[PDB]
User: What shape does this take?
Amino acid sequence: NNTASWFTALTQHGKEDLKFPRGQGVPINTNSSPDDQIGYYRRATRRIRGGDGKMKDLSPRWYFYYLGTGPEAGLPYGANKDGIIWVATEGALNTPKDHIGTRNPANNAAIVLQLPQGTTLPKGFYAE
Assistant: This one.
């Protein structure tokens, strides 16, 4: 607890897991350096009780954590895990980003997720 993504989420409207072409997907953060531009998005599921007394699955959200941080801080880049997808800018260093760490919501609001010009969000994904 008291740990969160530095950024706002991507929402999934389709059936396919989030996926970026190699070199794309790392949110913009002016307080970070070129070496730091690598990590993962982790799926967060939500469901609520409908009018019919059955659980309704809402659109999955995906949140970015820098490599070596967050709920999967221990996973190396490329590790295969459901709900985890990897992104990296060319020339980012494969080193943990402990100097960036995660966000404490008591101290800092999320950075608005923004992707560098020319980036393609996959079908059905939107930055809310």
Notes: The chain has one domain: 1-128.
